[PDB]
Amino acid sequence: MVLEATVLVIDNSEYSRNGDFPRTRFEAQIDSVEFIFQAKRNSNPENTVGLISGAGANPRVLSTFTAEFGKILAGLHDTQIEGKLHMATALQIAQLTLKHRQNKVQHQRIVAFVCSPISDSRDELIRLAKTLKKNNVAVDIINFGEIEQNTELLDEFIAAVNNPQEETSHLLTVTPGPRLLYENIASSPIILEEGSS
Amino acid sequence: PLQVARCTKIIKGNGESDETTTDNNNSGNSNSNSNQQSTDADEDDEDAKYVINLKQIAKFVVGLGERVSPTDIEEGMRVGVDRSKYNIELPLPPRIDPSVTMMTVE
Amino acid sequence: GDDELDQEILNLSTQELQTRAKLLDNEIRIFRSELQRLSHENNVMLEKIKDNKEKIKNNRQLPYLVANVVEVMDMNEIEDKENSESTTQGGNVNLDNTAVGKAAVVKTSSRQTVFLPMVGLVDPDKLKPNDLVGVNKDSYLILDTLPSEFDSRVKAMEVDEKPTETYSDVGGLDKQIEELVEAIVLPMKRADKFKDMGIRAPKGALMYGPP
Amino acid sequence: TGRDDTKETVYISSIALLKMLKHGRAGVPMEVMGLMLGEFVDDYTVNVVDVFAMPQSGTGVSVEAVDDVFQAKMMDMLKQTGRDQMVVGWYHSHPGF
């Protein structure tokens, strides 16, 4: 709820030009941002939502932390689409993005949209888990594209991270077919979950 | 010392404007240099611009004074302005012929 | 304008037009996000305009120099792939950057004739030969416009026909009073005829002789 | 007394001299201004480590011709790179005298 910085990892891929959410997934993921961004403000108006991309040849920063929803969407309009997820890589840049902030009181959380399965490895992801819980960063995986025709081994990393943290780590299933992507993440816990000591 | 000037003509910044805000001619508010409304989010201080010709015979639009009235400084009136900064501060007496005319009369 | 015409009601029944209503919402939410995209790009841009206009303000206000425009030169704009001037310099194509487009020749009151890179807010359009112009005092650029010069004696000179001497209080003087009418008064009044016929109007007159 | 009323011998770096000079001359004839960033130590030493120029004015340098919104914006950057230092005076160029 209160004082929280959240780095959105939004994937743009060859599984997201599919139209299970109207009129493709690119268009439904634009609508996910608006609801997320408003909700944070409603709890605490000093909340910032950041954005990076697991998409293309090299994951990159699309937008930095800002108090405006406008700037974040402005950056998202020009994204790659040819790439796939690189999950390990996404986490290391997002950790870096959460370092540079106006204040440091803000909670560290990463929420990652999965539209595409890993292009990396299990060997990498094991390492990432030990790395994250030292710094109290949560892994919270919205999957909806690694369950369409696939299986995920990401359940293991969620539990390995979760301890008393700033933000708890939990797995959020959203059907792959039509169910309206944007309202399902908004309805499901993304601030209803909070930390403990 | 003020460097000596006389107003050739007066043309006014409060109704032909002088800056760019939303208009390039005519101010409505007319106590401003460029504003036709107060919801611009700007206001200026303008009384009239006054075009003066110096005894250097270079010409300037010159700022306001510190007690000058728009009803004293008009065409044909001597005024003093700064010698490097070009702003009226104190006006000067009328005429400029008493130098030759006191000696001719007897 | 007109929604749910006669034609749509026959075609598709009410139940169907419910499924129609739901599909419409989903697409209205998509478009609705673009409005937030567009609003923002507009919001930042306003802020930029006012941040400029504040820097201008200081230079722009009175005091500044008075000058006259001798002629608007209308120097070339673009003939190269870099800058806007004939000569090749480090910059790039713009009105002002290191590039110089149009320019104009002014004769200052500081007794100099200045050819100057032209500003963004004064264009060559806004000028004509022999126009009085404010030029910034410290660096010589056309800074703002001014109307044409007016002088107290010039203003006076127009209208002084009264006292009137007529031709009833000037004793005789003919041929010459008749001649004066032919040159002046007669084409002045029947002016429309003189265009139609194609003859010239006398190109002034000279009246001369002992005082 | 409460003071020693003494002026420092001013140490101007390499980094500051060229910036001051380049902006004065391109900008001349026209008086121009900008702040000086440095470090103060002693009472006889004052360092002019870096400088940044502040925008043009044809009304010369005044306290009513400076852009404080610009000064603020620069100090905000200065903090994000981690180079923040205190203002140690100010520089200006006269235009020809």
Swiss-Prot record, chain A:
Transmembrane segments: none annotated. Ubiquitinated, leading to its degradation. Ubiquitination is promoted by HUL5. GO terms for cellular component: cytosol; nucleus; proteasome complex; proteasome regulatory particle, base subcomplex. One of its GO terms (molecular function) is polyubiquitin modification-dependent protein binding. Residues 5-190 form the VWFA domain. Keywords: Proteasome, Ubl conjugation. Present with 17200 molecules/cell in log phase SD medium. The 26S proteasome is composed of a core protease, known as the 20S proteasome, capped at one or both ends by the 19S regulatory complex (RC). The RC is composed of at least 18 different subunits in two subcomplexes, the base and the lid, which form the portions proximal and distal to the 20S proteolytic core, respectively. Belongs to the proteasome subunit S5A family. This is 26S proteasome regulatory subunit RPN10. It comes from Saccharomyces cerevisiae (strain ATCC 204508 / S288c) (Baker's yeast).
Swiss-Prot record, chain B:
The modification Phosphoserine is found at residue 69. Residues 22-39 have a biased composition (Low complexity). The N-terminus is blocked. Residues 13-45 are annotated as: Disordered. Disulfide bonds: none annotated. It is found in: Cytoplasm; Nucleus. Present with 105 molecules/cell in log phase SD medium. The 26S proteasome is involved in the ATP-dependent degradation of ubiquitinated proteins. The regulatory (or ATPase) complex confers ATP dependency and substrate specificity to the 26S complex. Interacts with UBR1 and CIC1. Belongs to the AAA ATPase family. This is 26S proteasome regulatory subunit 7 homolog. It comes from Saccharomyces cerevisiae (strain ATCC 204508 / S288c). The gene is RPT1.
Curated annotation (Swiss-Prot), chain C:
N-acetylated by NAT1. This is 26S proteasome regulatory subunit 6A. Coiled coil: none annotated. The modification Phosphotyrosine is found at residue 167. The 26S proteasome is involved in the ATP-dependent degradation of ubiquitinated proteins. The regulatory (or ATPase) complex confers ATP dependency and substrate specificity to the 26S complex. Belongs to the AAA ATPase family. It is found in: Cytoplasm; Nucleus.
From Swiss-Prot, chain D:
Residues 10-97 form the MPN domain. N-acetylated by NAT3. Component of the lid subcomplex of the 19S proteasome regulatory particle complex (also named PA700 complex). The 26S proteasome consists of a 20S proteasome core and two 19S regulatory subunits. Interacts directly with RPN8 and STS1. Present with 16400 molecules/cell in log phase SD medium. Belongs to the peptidase M67A family. The JAMM motif is required for the deubiquitination and degradation of ubiquitinated substrates. Component of the lid subcomplex of the 26S proteasome, a multiprotein complex involved in the ATP-dependent degradation of ubiquitinated proteins. RPN11 is the only catalytically active member of the lid and serves as the essential deubiquitinase of the proteasome. This is Ubiquitin carboxyl-terminal hydrolase RPN11. It comes from Saccharomyces cerevisiae (strain ATCC 204508 / S288c) (Baker's yeast). The chain holds residues 18 to 114 of 306 of the full protein.
